[PDB]
Design a protein around this ligand. Structure first.
Ligand code: HEM
Ligand code: HEM
Ligand SMILES: C[C@H](O)[C@H](O)[C@H]1CNc2nc(N)[nH]c(=O)c2N1
Ligand SMILES: C[C@H](O)[C@H](O)[C@H]1CNc2nc(N)[nH]c(=O)c2N1
Ligand SMILES: N=C(NO)NCCC[C@H](N)C(=O)O
Ligand SMILES: N=C(NO)NCCC[C@H](N)C(=O)O
Ligand SMILES: [Zn+2]
Lengths: 412, 413
């Protein structure tokens, strides 16, 4: 019930008490660990007040006014409001604190050393999809910042009766399209094939290239979603070259500078924010290892290996591994040279370790999902590989949610 | 949850696990905490032993298609009387073989399990002394090494009785290199074995004090104080490490042993506890080239290799570490293959494991696996295992951790 975590390179041991404040289930039971499962599985008035109270208590505790008249007044006010209006509204301060802490609590995010510097854009006054498009352009421009990226979240109106949800249908603000071809193959990004079909279905005139920035498909107030194209001038892209291989540029590879997860649900004080796109900056392996080398993504390893002239007749030459490293040298070098913020996995993981220690010291723990935190290349040469971690759910939190095309009731 | 789906995210293959229902002990996980990445998480009375014996013999008799037979029922009766009467019981030879193979089959951290049915079991339960253990252990090493054509094997010494007569191999592996902490605070040899090296020296080992000294065996029989033995050098197969392109690599002075033989685990079969049960297969290359060589707390050669490669070591963003890691691993696989010592690369190993795993779902209803351990410590997502959801749970028979015996041993003098 007070749990210890050990680092096996440094022999440092930290003691976790924060996990006792953990709310929802993990997936795992006593007889079965589901640690490697990616997805392991509206609120009534009575459901909402304990949640609201739980949140408000931590808010007022953070500003050193726990048990104050200010605290008791707010709790009563919110209580009155849920009783009468079946939901409630957060003050701006509570929204900002909640969104920062959702990030602070995000156990799969290696970038949390930065958690308190989040720029929060309150888009709760938004009513239409054009409003949504304007908010998002402003977010994209604020966050990109000419290549000197800055973290931000834009929060649209909270779910009410579940029939007036705001959603961004995209999985990220900026992603490339995918097209299934007549020769069975895939052009562009296979991750996005379905969402691209939905765009075309809804009107999008697809260019049918490899790196087509997808349009935004935005749903306001439960209405049917509408398409909008992000101003091209707002989408910073980086062309991929290698400092030593002149032929690399001829692979014709680019990637975008701004990672902006847009399909998650932000839960604060029981309230549910279904449209809450957020952005930081890339760790290099995200692009070089996963986006480029997953067999089900752009799957370029063989192409690169061939051009490096590696011995590909046997796995034990480690040609896959040699290519992977060079692909990742190229990503990093390309971003650095264009002056676009990017972090390498060594620097990223060392910062997370420093953050874990800070968090253990000042908060009594840090929920972390080892499976996600350890990079997909060179695991054991990063310090996080050697670090025991405890994954648990704290609120406020970011949550996965059903893709909306599986759920939406098309009015037409 | 009589049915649990796991998905592969590359192929969309979904497999259904029913085997977890037969899961015995626990994981250290509760409903509100996942300790997936914790390395060591949280004598038997008659009461406790007969169900464990029954459970196991039901499994054994079921596997040989004689469940419920007179032979099955007679054996249950015979074991039951033996426990009641003597407090323990003895496994038949066939049952011990079945048990040992099944502990391997069930070992959730082992990527080598496609081979589980081919284990050579050496029955050492007639052993009474440490010199006896040394002889058995020598025979295991020679059989398993097989001049470089490695064969999986396990040697099983007598089981625990009262906890005061345990057989233990104090070595963590049968073959490992000594580590020596210097006065200036550096380490010569393998830092993982400093404590054990010190114990050996205390017991009378004359340490050559080099970087790659094969440790002596420290063997406890029947609860007695352990005794030292040198494994005959002729039986210890080693491989000097060189690179197919970099001729300066050999001058790093690197070598490694060919036989990985874990000697400090406990084998549980039918409730019985076998505290000395060394086993050996063959290396996956990343064990040596990523962990043994490049862990900071091991030989830590990454810098020296990168300097000699003249990589840009000013900025981690050159990925010099990653570049060196790969060349070192090329060198390990090259060196073993050239000398004809069995070794498997992490692509082949992981591809084979996914096949093994799918086959186990279909024929067994499951395959417990620990993703944290199965995914290799380099190039993770370019191996198929990374993309595979895995369920970790404990089946018996099993291999278990046990405390180091210097921590528990009652010295006779
Ligand atoms: C500022 C620099 C940031 C860095 C370097 C970073 C890094 C990462 C990485 C590498 C992942 C794993 C991504 C993947 O494998 O797809 C991740 C996941 C995640 N991050 Fe961050 N991140 C940053 C900013 C943020 C921000 C601003 C938020 C929220 C406000 C956030 C919340 C999350 C969440 C909820 C996940 C899980 C995503 C999922 O399950 O798909 N991160 N982060
Ligand atoms: C035959 C070829 C084999 C291969 C390629 C193989 C591969 C591996 C690897 C790479 C590990 C991780 C080791 C580490 O990180 O230290 C491992 C762990 C393990 N293996 Fe195997 N293995 C083989 C044979 C065996 C045998 C014969 C047994 C038992 C009879 C076995 C049982 C285990 C167990 C219990 C672990 C976990 C060890 C621990 O917890 O420290 N393996 N295996
Ligand atoms: C803390 C973490 O569990 C630890 O470093 C684990 C990671 N995964 C592992 N995987 C293998 N195969 N061997 C190990 O020693 C480790 N150690
Ligand atoms: C099956 C396994 O959960 C899956 O492939 C996970 C592994 N760890 C991950 N880690 C990160 N950061 N991102 C991912 O998408 C994955 N996917
Ligand atoms: N660093 C971040 N967020 O700030 N990553 C978000 C997920 C991005 C996704 N992994 C990609 O490679 O496109
Ligand atoms: N492949 C096996 N056994 O067959 N490994 C046993 C553990 C060896 C340990 N990882 C080492 O690098 O020495
Ligand atoms: Zn778990």
């Amino acid at each position: 019930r007070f749990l210890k975590v050990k680092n096996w390179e440094t022999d440092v041991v930290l003691t976790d008490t924060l996990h006792l404040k953990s709310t929802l289930e993990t997936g795992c039971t006593e007889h079965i660990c589901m640690g490697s499962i990616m997805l392991p599985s509206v609120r009534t008035k009575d459901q909402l007040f304990p949640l609201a109270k739980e949140f408000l208590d931590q808010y007022y505790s953070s500003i050193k006014r726990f048990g104050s008249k200010a605290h008791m007044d707010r709790l009563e006010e919110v209580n009155k409001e849920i009783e009468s209006t079946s939901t409630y509204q957060l003050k701006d301060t509570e929204l900002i604190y909640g969104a920062k802490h959702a990030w602070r609590n995000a156990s799969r995010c290696v970038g949390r050393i930065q958690w308190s510097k989040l720029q929060v854009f309150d888009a709760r006054d938004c009513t239409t999809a054009h409003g949504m498009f304007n908010y998002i352009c402003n977010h994209v421009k604020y966050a990109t910042n000419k290549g000197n990226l800055r973290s931000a979240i834009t929060i649209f109106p909270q779910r009410t009766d579940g029939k007036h949800d705001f959603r961004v249908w995209n999985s990220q603000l900026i992603r490339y399209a995918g097209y299934k071809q007549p020769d069975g193959s895939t052009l562009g990004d296979p991750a996005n094939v379905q969402f691209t079909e939905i765009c075309i279905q809804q009107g999008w005139k697809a260019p049918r290239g490899r790196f087509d920035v997808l349009p935004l498909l935005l749903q306001a107030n439960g209405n049917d979603p509408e398409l909008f194209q992000i101003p091209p001038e707002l989408v910073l892209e980086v062309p991929i070259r290698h400092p030593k291989f002149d032929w690399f540029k001829d692979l014709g590879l680019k990637w975008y500078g701004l990672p902006a997860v847009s399909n998650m649900l932000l839960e604060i004080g029981g309230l549910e924010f279904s449209a809450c796109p957020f952005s930081g900056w890339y760790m290099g392996t995200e692009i070089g290892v996963r986006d480029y080398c997953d067999n089900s993504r752009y799957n370029i390893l063989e192409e690169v290996a061939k051009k490096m002239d590696l011995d590909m007749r046997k796995t034990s030459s480690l040609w896959k591994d040699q290519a992977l490293v060079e692909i990742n040298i190229a990503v990093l070098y390309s971003f650095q040279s264009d002056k676009v913020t990017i972090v390498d996995h060594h620097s990223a993981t060392e910062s997370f370790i420093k953050h874990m220690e800070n968090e253990y010291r000042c908060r009594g723990g840090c929920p972390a999902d080892w499976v996600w935190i350890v990079p997909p290349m060179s695991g054991s040469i990063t310090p996080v590989f050697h670090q025991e971690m405890l994954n648990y759910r704290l609120t406020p939190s970011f949550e996965y949610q059903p893709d909306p095309w599986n759920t939406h009731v098309w009015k037409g």
